[PDB]
């Protein structure tokens, strides 16, 4: 029979770097109905966002 004892100390020094590039499109919509005592309106909107 045999017994083994072991100790281990590890020093790990690590580097990392990164880039990233995002390209974002977007198409918005809107409708609106306004109403007052004697004033009524309506509105339609649309939006085109690049990024």
């Amino acid at each position: 029979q045999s017994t083994q004892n072991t100790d281990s100390q590890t020093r790990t020094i690590s580097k990392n770097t990164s880039t990233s590039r995002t390209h974002t499109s977007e198409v918005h919509g809107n409708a609106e109905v306004h109403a007052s005592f004697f004033d009524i309106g309506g509105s339609v909107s649309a939006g085109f966002s690049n990024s």
Binding site: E26, H34, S36, D39, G41, S49
Partner: peptide, 23 residues
């Protein structure tokens, strides 16, 4: 100034819109 008052009431009849950021 009646015409100016009518223009002011017409301007009041609406919204100054909203401030939205999509950053």
């Amino acid at each position: 100034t009646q015409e100016e008052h009518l223009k002011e009431i017409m301007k009041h009849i609406v919204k100054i819109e909203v401030k939205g950021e999509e950053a």
